[PDB]
Amino acid sequence: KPVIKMYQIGDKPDNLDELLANANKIIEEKVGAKLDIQYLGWGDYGKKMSVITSSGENYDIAFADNYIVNAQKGAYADLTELYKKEGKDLYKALDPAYIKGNTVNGKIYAVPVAANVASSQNFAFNGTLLAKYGIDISGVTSYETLEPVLKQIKEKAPDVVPFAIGKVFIPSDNFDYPVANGLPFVIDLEGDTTKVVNRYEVPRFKEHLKTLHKFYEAGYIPKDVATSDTFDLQQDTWFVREETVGPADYGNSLLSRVANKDIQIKPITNFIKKNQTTQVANFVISNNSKNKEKSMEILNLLNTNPELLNGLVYGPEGKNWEKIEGKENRVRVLDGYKGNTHMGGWNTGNNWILYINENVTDQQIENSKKELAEAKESPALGFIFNTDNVKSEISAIANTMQQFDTAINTGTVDPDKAIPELMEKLKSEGAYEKVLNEMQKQYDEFLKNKK
């Protein structure tokens, strides 16, 4: 009977009507409701979602935007009770880090999509060029050790961009940024895990920037890196890129499929479960929703029913995909899947009930299982930085930071010159040390509780 309205980020599938009509046969029979999914786009999602949540505007489910803050404001139904019955199977199937990462004032407001609960940063190499020039990447574990292979591609293929990075680039390390900004503050997971530090004062981080500046000067990264936001994976204009890979991607499988060619990966950071990885794809139930129970029931089903979820994420069976006879849980993806004819895997539901593409090797499935099992939590997982005392000081730092940020992070300027200038500018007003100490203070209390 009741129509449950869901808001989703991005652009609709071409066949959304058909997808939902197929899905709703299962939903209607299982729960006695029907799902309506409306897509609000990519660009202005926050903006659109903020209007919806501020007014008494009717919706039941939404892909959450600015989740942590809105959860504190009571914008979302408390799922604590919802999870013991209606969301029982979903709660049981969720990795503990998903609950921890999404708890706000002692309660859970989210149905997170179980996927890349942990992720690593990787160099992704263009296998076509790797094979053409016989370039050996077995020594590559860091920015520093990337240098010899960049020199070789510069040698051998001078029109190719060696390291394809853009204006958004910053070196990755084993750091946790618990609060999504804006700000240079991290927990160094290899340092003192009790201390909030500035990334630009971490010795090996400064070394990454020195390396990147050398890479800049040698022509390994675009001259116009600071203004560029361009390198389609399928094209051969690039040699190496930085890519986030998690267990739901099955190693190089996802990248190699999208690139439609061999993509080889070399990790540079450890697989970590943190705020960023546990909060990336959350569904929320509206605080002012007439069917909280049934909305939760649909979410339970979306995340536990293989036929339902696979129909949505892979699209029409027989046209977009086929089951492999004799191989349970395995599918052959067809030409139709190349279209905009299905929903996204990352933001629809539990990836662990998704059928596994035939091109994923046995070793990749095993490697994925192990990485997921062996992934450690950050000590800052579930840390909420309350900005109420420091909202003005935060904007002041952001304002200063945003002037020098891009030049430094891309390695456009010499960090030996630019970091001391930026630090001097920040330390010359009062905002910087206030936000740092406030963050440290809250992180102290966070670790004291728990313990």
Side-chain angles (χ1 to χ4, degrees), residues 2-27 29-56 58-80 82-87 89-91 93-106 108-178 180 182-205 207-228 230-231 233-286 289-324 326-327 329-390 392-398 400-401 404-428 430-433 435-451:
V3 176
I4 299 308
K5 171 142 57 70
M6 193 186 110
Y7 283 121
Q8 182 60 292
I9 197 168
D11 308 314
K12 65 188 183 167
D14 308 335
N15 59 344
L16 175 59
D17 275 18
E18 285 163 31
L19 299 171
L20 286 176
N22 190 247
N24 278 314
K25 300 170 177 303
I26 300 141
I27 298 153
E29 181 172 45
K30 294 254 105 192
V31 307
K34 290 191 193 299
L35 182 64
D36 188 34
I37 304 173
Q38 280 161 33
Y39 287 79
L40 301 177
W42 285 113
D44 300 305
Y45 190 77
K47 185 194 176 168
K48 294 196 182 82
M49 200 33 53
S50 191
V51 179
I52 307 305
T53 192
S54 295
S55 58
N58 171 239
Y59 81 93
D60 302 283
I61 307 165
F63 180 91
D65 174 89
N66 214 287
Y67 168 80
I68 295 291
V69 179
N70 289 320
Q72 280 169 315
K73 290 191 199 158
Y76 311 137
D78 169 48
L79 270 35
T80 323
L82 256 3
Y83 270 127
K84 206 178 81 75
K85 201 216 286 168
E86 291 95 348
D89 316 72
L90 162 60
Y91 192 95
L94 277 175
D95 183 309
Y98 276 123
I99 313 296
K100 214 172 302 290
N102 290 297
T103 292
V104 193
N105 321 344
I108 180 101
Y109 299 95
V111 171
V113 174
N116 291 323
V117 69
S119 73
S120 57
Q121 293 303 110
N122 298 79
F123 296 135
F125 293 87
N126 188 333
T128 306
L129 301 170
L130 232 40
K132 193 180 281 144
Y133 299 109
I135 294 178
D136 176 12
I137 55 161
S138 63
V140 178
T141 61
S142 62
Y143 301 109
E144 286 73 17
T145 59
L146 195 70
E147 199 176 86
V149 306
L150 297 180
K151 199 181 201 306
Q152 291 163 60
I153 199 76
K154 192 76 188 182
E155 251 162 61
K156 295 160 185 281
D159 290 324
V160 169
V161 173
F163 188 23
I165 59 148
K167 71 186 198 287
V168 83
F169 184 86
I170 178 143
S172 305
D173 211 298
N174 292 313
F175 294 162
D176 189 1
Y177 304 80
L183 294 179
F185 305 125
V186 293
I187 301 86
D188 184 358
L189 300 180
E190 309 176 13
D192 179 344
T193 55
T194 75
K195 208 191 179 195
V196 178
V197 299
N198 190 312
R199 70 189 177 198
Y200 302 115
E201 296 179 311
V202 182
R204 76 199 191 270
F205 188 81
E207 295 296 341
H208 300 328
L209 296 160
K210 291 188 73 184
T211 298
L212 264 283
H213 187 65
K214 298 193 188 310
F215 285 10
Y216 184 80
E217 294 199 292
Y220 303 153
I221 64 139
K223 187 176 184 301
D224 67 332
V225 66
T227 59
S228 188
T230 49
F231 287 74
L233 282 156
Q234 312 214 354
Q235 299 315 298
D236 285 314
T237 44
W238 63 274
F239 174 72
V240 65
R241 289 157 90 256
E242 195 162 323
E243 289 301 321
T244 300
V245 181
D249 310 348
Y250 301 104
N252 75 344
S253 295
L254 183 57
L255 287 163
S256 305
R257 185 180 68 69
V258 181
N260 193 236
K261 56 193 215 262
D262 182 52
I263 304 296
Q264 286 167 56
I265 59 162
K266 295 310 269 195
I268 59 160
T269 66
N270 293 322
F271 284 79
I272 295 293
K273 304 172 178 186
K274 51 194 187 169
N275 282 353
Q276 194 224 34
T277 63
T278 57
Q279 301 161 0
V280 72
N282 292 331
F283 290 97
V284 287
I285 298 174
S286 182
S289 155
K290 275 145 204 188
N291 298 291
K292 289 174 172 59
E293 290 76 18
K294 277 180 174 188
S295 296
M296 188 61 252
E297 284 184 291
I298 293 174
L299 296 163
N300 186 70
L301 201 60
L302 272 176
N303 289 272
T304 54
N305 195 291
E307 202 200 339
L308 175 62
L309 184 65
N310 285 283
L312 292 165
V313 172
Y314 283 109
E317 193 177 359
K319 181 177 189 180
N320 276 17
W321 60 281
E322 276 173 353
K323 285 167 192 219
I324 296 155
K327 305 286 288 297
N329 210 37
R330 299 290 227 139
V331 296
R332 170 176 43 249
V333 166
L334 307 172
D335 271 0
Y337 183 80
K338 280 160 64 202
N340 178 42
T341 51
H342 53 88
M343 306 186 168
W346 74 284
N347 66 340
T348 304
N350 187 357
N351 288 28
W352 310 118
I353 70 167
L354 293 179
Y355 304 144
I356 294 160
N357 194 308
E358 68 176 343
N359 300 328
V360 180
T361 67
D362 289 348
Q363 186 61 44
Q364 286 166 321
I365 297 167
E366 280 304 308
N367 293 337
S368 169
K369 281 214 214 83
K370 189 173 79 78
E371 294 304 343
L372 192 74
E374 293 182 5
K376 291 159 220 294
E377 294 182 10
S378 168
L381 175 67
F383 177 59
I384 296 167
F385 181 53
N386 183 14
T387 72
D388 286 344
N389 283 20
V390 284
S392 313
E393 294 90 329
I394 283 165
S395 278
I397 298 162
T400 302
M401 268 268 291
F404 308 115
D405 225 344
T406 307
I408 301 162
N409 294 343
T410 54
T412 301
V413 294
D414 187 345
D416 285 322
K417 180 198 191 286
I419 297 161
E421 293 176 345
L422 162 68
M423 286 323 150
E424 207 169 314
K425 200 160 176 202
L426 295 167
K427 285 197 185 109
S428 63
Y432 175 82
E433 296 282 3
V435 176
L436 180 61
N437 295 326
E438 180 61 19
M439 199 176 275
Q440 188 62 63
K441 191 196 150 159
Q442 291 188 39
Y443 189 55
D444 288 343
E445 273 279 338
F446 175 76
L447 301 181
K448 186 175 168 301
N449 319 333
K450 277 207 289 173
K451 210 165 85 169

